Amino acid sequence: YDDFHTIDWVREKCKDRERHRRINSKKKESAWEMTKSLYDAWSGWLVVTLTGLASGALAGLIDIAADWMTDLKEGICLSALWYNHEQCCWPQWKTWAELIIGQAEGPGSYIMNYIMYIFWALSFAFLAVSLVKVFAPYACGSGIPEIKTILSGFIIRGYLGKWTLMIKTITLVLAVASGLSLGKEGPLVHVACCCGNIFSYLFPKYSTNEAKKREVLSAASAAGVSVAFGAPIGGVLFSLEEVSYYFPLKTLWRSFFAALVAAFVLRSINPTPWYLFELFPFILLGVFGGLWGAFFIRANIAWCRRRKSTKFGKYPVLEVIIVAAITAVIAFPNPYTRLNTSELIKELFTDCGYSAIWQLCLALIFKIIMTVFTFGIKVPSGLFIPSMAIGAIAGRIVGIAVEQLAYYHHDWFIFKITPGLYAMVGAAACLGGVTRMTVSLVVIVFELTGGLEYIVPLMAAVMTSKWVGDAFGREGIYEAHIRLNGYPFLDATTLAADVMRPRSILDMSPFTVTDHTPMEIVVDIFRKLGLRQCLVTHNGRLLGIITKKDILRHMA
Amino acid sequence: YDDFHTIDWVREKCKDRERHRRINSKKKESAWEMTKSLYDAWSGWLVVTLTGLASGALAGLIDIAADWMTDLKEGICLSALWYNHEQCCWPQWKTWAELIIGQAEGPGSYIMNYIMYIFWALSFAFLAVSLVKVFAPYACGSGIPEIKTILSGFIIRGYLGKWTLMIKTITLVLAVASGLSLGKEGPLVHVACCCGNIFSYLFPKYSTNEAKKREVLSAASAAGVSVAFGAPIGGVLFSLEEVSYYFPLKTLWRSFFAALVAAFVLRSINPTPWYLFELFPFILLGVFGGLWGAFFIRANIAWCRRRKSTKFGKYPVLEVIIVAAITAVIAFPNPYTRLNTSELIKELFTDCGYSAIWQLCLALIFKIIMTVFTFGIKVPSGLFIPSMAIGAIAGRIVGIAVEQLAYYHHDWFIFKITPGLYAMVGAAACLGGVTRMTVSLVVIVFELTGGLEYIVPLMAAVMTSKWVGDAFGREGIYEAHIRLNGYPFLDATTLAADVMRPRSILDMSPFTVTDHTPMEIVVDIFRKLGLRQCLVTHNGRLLGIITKKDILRHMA
Ligand SMILES: [Cl-]
Ligand SMILES: [Cl-]
Ligand SMILES: [Cl-]
Ligand SMILES: [Cl-]
Ligand SMILES: [Cl-]
Ligand SMILES: [Cl-]
């Protein structure tokens, strides 16, 4: 296959079985051959394990460097120059103003801090876009859409290579620390799959074949979601639901091992009940979640579809610099948009132990705008953590509203409340209303805290979010960005006449369909079997051909 | 399709989609039609839920009645005639000897108790076999093999009906209380699937089609395993791994809801760390588990294959009576085989707070013999709980051996121990060495207690058990009993020439395969697409045919 060509799944199976026959022919001869056979099976298993280990280590390293640089934005701890703001306190911390001006508070100190924050955001974003564009342009974007296309038989050559992995890790640290409204969670699905591909080359079962490396990539997507959220079961379900549609009963256990290994290695790397009357707020958040998703999926796509039909497409670096400058300028004054979005999530998910509503509302509006304008620019811009932050801010605003309403009106028969729970519900609602996921997401949240008492709220909000978000288009953000890039991804009354062109190497087993066959049956054949091209005959006459491209063109 | 014919999966899909088209044609017209569409989707969901509820209620009711009758074997509590031995103590309890003879201990009292125990075992077993043979012969056996064949497109008409369900429930209570070395766990997979089928008839989406009820049966098998072990995730995995091989991403969430609902309703119905040096014992149990399975699968099958080639086949009732008489005669004297096997498991899994080894060894030998001779006779004989009891007795024997060895030799550098953990490990090893399951089983055990500290022992023992049991034949007990009954179950170098016969209703879309096609490709096409018969052409000539029967004969 040449680049950007979908794979003939049947031939992948045939060559796999031919290698099985070759190996098994000599397997029984000598003890070394049985050792080699066990070695091949355990080689599949070490591919899963190495993917898990590397994904965990890279997720941990990205987390550490992202935190350090995000805090470097606004100060430096003179004691040790390798601790962040919340690490050398564990006077010691001196922001840039007193480092230069010498004083703590005052108009001059504030202006100096503001300028330094803007400059550091600009410099980090500029480095991110520079490195990605110059060294590995395949490192931009969340990277899950093309992974779903790759697992669906597509070839993008350098999309999961060494250079894409290196530049995505570096520029994902830099883009997280630049303050852009993006994440390092989906990008970690892409980085986990980059590890999966890079390790598949080690062993001959997967380096030679394309079906087997698609299995390994399923496992790697599971591991990536695990490290992204720290939810091994959640990562397995995320691979199951969104990133793949081929699970031959094995690339579930292998996904689970990858996810568990990655979560454990991530952990190593570190140098109150709700009342029934709250479901109405919880469901409310769900609806908001849905709307968000819907809005986003339209708006963002429009923007991306506009970036390909105007000057922007030729100006990536200027775009990233401008977005980073606007983000930094409008983010600093507000003490909630200044914080790392992950730090804002940790702050908004926790319980306390009018200004808050105003500042949270401003944070919400700013994040909603800047994620629409951010997701897509040429930096490793994930989409889990800013969707969670938008949802969490909305949830906490609703929780504070409930607190005030109950306190001022507790005489109501309804009440006769932990805002952290509202933040969790809103985050799950807004994360499932975009990506259009139902259960994997709820499971990720359940393992994100472990409490079983929040399954009803989370399930209710996530389901409502998906139901409301589907009313504006069934396809999610990661599939609506395939239908935009026009990849040949076959989504999982007409005949074969309507979709047939024309209007030692001889493949001796071409699967044929009669012209009178329903089209839906041919689509089903391609989906279940993954055929690349099927002849269409009339009474056994070499009459026409159908290819995935033809089916897709009919779909479009 | 007539009885005992496998289904053409493609036509099932086609009729399903035709019903979708018909419904959607009128769906948008009036609000009632949209309500009907939502009603159809939620009808699939209420089928899952009703299956879960009925399975939970029947599992609870079977548990209650089985316990009461098992204790009725050996006494009666005069205060209330609806409590068991361990329920009216919660002088009150008078065994048959003091009820009739009037005295408690003495040769006469013991003989009277022994005779009463034997007589009650005989009467319960005789009722079990009588009812099954006279009213519903489809109620015998574990019932999972034919369920795996049914989910694989087979028709057995009355195998999942009202009469099979009623008689399996009644005779499963009676066969559990008769002391036969059998269970009510696998039988509960069959009873859950009987509920699934009986409820599929309620709604028109599933009553009309065969693919859709196969999905419902997947969900029902999940619910049945849930009630059997009280492990909803374990039940979902058991359906995933053993009872089905079609999971279109939906009959996972539906399986999970069925399993959760059934476990919860079952709950409603109720009127120490291990040291590293123990893995060597744990793995040892695993090996034993494996061997057991292997032995059993051969031995039992031989017996079953002998029951079909001798007088036995014409004498079911005499066989059940004789087996029950021998079981009762040899079980009473020993205080461990006298107890309900579930009670023996609850006792062998718990910690204390030379006679024991001898009596546990006698229990083990007796159970190993009587389950080989029992599984198969015409009573609802499950195979989970006696395999677990054999494994638990072996595990506890090993745990006691470890206790004695360490106590008498603690000076050994190895030690410088909870037998309940050994019982758990042995039960899991012996249950996975028979059924050849790896992860579903470990997950069931993990949820059977909830402790995470026992995942390494259980995983090690179960994996070793499967590896050792596969060395004597890959097929498990529930598939080796399909290859005995010869059902057309397509298990998930030659051409189509080698396996082709001869050596408004016109189906207009027959899927041809060229004579030069590899056989493996045709088998794969049948498996992934579930075709019933495929033409085979030479240069588009109506040359020969292949049917599932032909492929199966080829393997046979
Ligand atoms: Cl992307
Ligand atoms: Cl993210
Ligand atoms: Cl993402
Ligand atoms: Cl059976
Ligand atoms: Cl059982
Ligand atoms: Cl069973």
Dump the DSSP string for A28-85.
TTSHHHHHHHHHHHHHHHHHHHHHHHHHHHHHHHHHHHHHHHHHHTT-EESS-TT--T
Query: Which strand (E) or helix (H) includes residue B533?
Result: strand B533-537
Nearest CA distance, A516 vs chain B (angstrom): 7
Question: How far is it, in rounded angstroms, from Cα B542 to Cα B170?
Answer: 53
Residues in chain A with CB shorter than 8 Å from the CB of B537 are 540
Chain A residues within 8 Å of chain B (Cβ atoms): 10, 13-14, 17, 21, 240-241, 245, 247, 249, 252-253, 256, 438-439, 492-493, 508-514, 516-518, 520-521, 524-525, 528-529, 537, 539-541
Question: How far is it, in rounded angstroms, from Cα B260 to Cα A444?
Answer: 18
- Say whether B541 and A540 touch across the interface (CB within 8 A): yes
Question: How far is it, in rounded angstroms, from Cα B128 to Cα B124?
Answer: 6
Question: How far is it, in rounded angstroms, from Cα B265 to Cα B259?
Answer: 10
Residues in chain B with CB shorter than 8 Å from the CB of A511 are 513, 525
Q: Select from B17, B510, B516 the Cβ nearest to the Cβ of A509.
A: B516
Question: How far is it, in rounded angstroms, from Cα A432 to Cα A462?
Answer: 6
> In sequence order, which residues have a C-beta less than 8 Å from that of residue A432 and are 6 or more positions away?
A289, A293, A438, A441, A442, A462, A465, A466
Task: Read off the amino acid at residue B525.
Answer: I
Q: Which of A521, A522, A534 is best to mutate for the B interface (most B CBs within 10 A)?
A: A521
Residues in chain B with CB shorter than 8 Å from the CB of A245 are 249
Strands B76-77 and A542-547, bridge-based pairing: unpaired
> How far, in Å, from the CA of A212 to the mean position of ligand 1?
24
Does the annotation place A95 within a ligand binding site? no
CB B248 within 8 A of CB B426: no
Q: Which of B512, B513, B537 is best to mutate for the A interface (most A CBs within 10 A)?
A: B512
Least Cα distance to A370 among A394, A386, A346 occurs for A386
Does the annotation place B367 within a ligand binding site? no
In the numeric block, which tokens belong to residue A282? 């919880």
Q: Quick one: closest CA in A to B517, which residue?
A: A509
Residues in chain A with CB shorter than 8 Å from the CB of B514 are 508-510, 512
Nearest CA distance, A346 vs chain B (angstrom): 27
Residue B518: asked if its preceding bond is cis (omega within 30°), the reply is no
Q: How would you write A387-417 as a 3-class SS string?
A: HHHHHHHHHHHHHHHHHHHHHHHCCCCCCCC
Based on the number of CB atoms within 10 Å of its own CB, is B86 exposed (0-12), middle (13-18) or buried (19 or more)?
A: exposed
Q: Quick one: closest CA in A to B240, which residue?
A: A249
A514 phi/psi in degrees, rounded to 5: -65, 150
- Say whether B14 and A521 touch across the interface (CB within 8 A): yes
Q: Select from A13, A514, A537 the Cβ nearest to the Cβ of B524.
A: A13
Strands A76-77 and A93-94, bridge-based pairing: antiparallel
CB A376 within 8 A of CB A307: yes
Query: Which strand (E) or helix (H) includes residue A232?
Result: helix A232-238
Question: How far is it, in rounded angstroms, from Cα A255 to Cα A248?
Answer: 12
Q: What share of chain A is helix, strand, coil (3-state, %, to 5)?
A: 65, 5, 30
Q: Which of A514, A526, A527, A542 is best to mutate for the B interface (most B CBs within 10 A)?
A: A514
Produce one character per residue of A264-302: b if its CB has 16 or more CB atoms within 10 Å, e if not: ebbeeeeeeebeeebbebbbbbbbbbbbbbbbbbebbbe
B69 phi/psi in degrees, rounded to 5: -75, -35
In the numeric block, which tokens belong to residue B277? 């040096």
Give the torsion sign (CA, A318, A323, A328, A329).
Answer: positive
Does the annotation place A142 within a ligand binding site? yes
Would you call B84 helix, strand, or coil by DSSP?
coil
Breaks (C-N over 2.5 A) in chain A follow: 90, 271, 353, 416, 492, 503
Q: Select from A249, A524, A537 the Cβ nearest to the Cβ of B241.
A: A249
Question: For B523, what's the count of Cα atoms within 13 Å in the CB-facing half-sphere?
Answer: 20
B314 phi/psi in degrees, rounded to 5: -95, 0
Least Cα distance to A250 among A286, A218, A204 occurs for A218
In the numeric block, which tokens belong to residue B530? 């579930």
Based on the number of CB atoms within 10 Å of its own CB, is A329 exposed (0-12), middle (13-18) or buried (19 or more)?
A: middle
CA distances from A224 to A148, A240, A377, A462, B109 (A): 14, 13, 22, 22, 69
CA A246 from centroid of its chain's CA atoms: 19
Q: Quick one: closest CA in A to B529, which residue?
A: A528
B358 phi/psi in degrees, rounded to 5: -60, -45
A176 phi/psi in degrees, rounded to 5: -70, -45
- Say whether A516 and B509 touch across the interface (CB within 8 A): yes
- Say whether A240 and B249 touch across the interface (CB within 8 A): yes
Q: Quick one: closest CA in A to B440, which residue?
A: A253
Residues in chain B: 556
Does the annotation place A478 within a ligand binding site? yes
Question: How far is it, in rounded angstroms, from Cα A103 to Cα A5?
Answer: 62
Maximum pairwise Cα distance, chain B: 90
Which residues is B93 bridged to in the sheet? B77
Strands B513-514 and B533-537, bridge-based pairing: parallel
> How far, in Å, from the CA of B481 to the mean position of ligand 4?
7
DSSP state of A94: E
Residues with CB under 5 A from ligand 1 (ion): A 141-142, 145
Q: Select from B509, B514, B529 the Cβ nearest to the Cβ of A509.
A: B514
In the numeric block, which tokens belong to residue A221? 């997507």
Q: Quick one: closest CA in A to B540, which residue?
A: A540
Q: How would you write A437-462 as a 3-class SS string?
A: CCHHHHHHHHHHHCCHHHHHHHHHHH
DSSP state of B501: B
Residues in chain A with CB shorter than 8 Å from the CB of B256 are 439
Nearest CA distance, B513 vs chain A (angstrom): 7
Would you call A264 helix, strand, or coil by DSSP?
helix
> How far, in Å, from the CA of B346 to the mean position of ligand 6?
19
Residues in chain A with CB shorter than 8 Å from the CB of B524 are 10, 13
- Say whether A17 and B438 touch across the interface (CB within 8 A): no
CA distances from A368 to A56, A63, A337 (A): 30, 24, 12
- Say whether B438 and A518 touch across the interface (CB within 8 A): no
Least Cα distance to A479 among A177, A181, A151 occurs for A151
> How far, in Å, from the CA of A184 to the mean position of ligand 3?
8
> How far, in Å, from the CA of B154 to the mean position of ligand 6?
19
- Say whether A21 and B493 touch across the interface (CB within 8 A): yes
Q: Select from B240, B249, B521 the Cβ nearest to the Cβ of A509.
A: B521
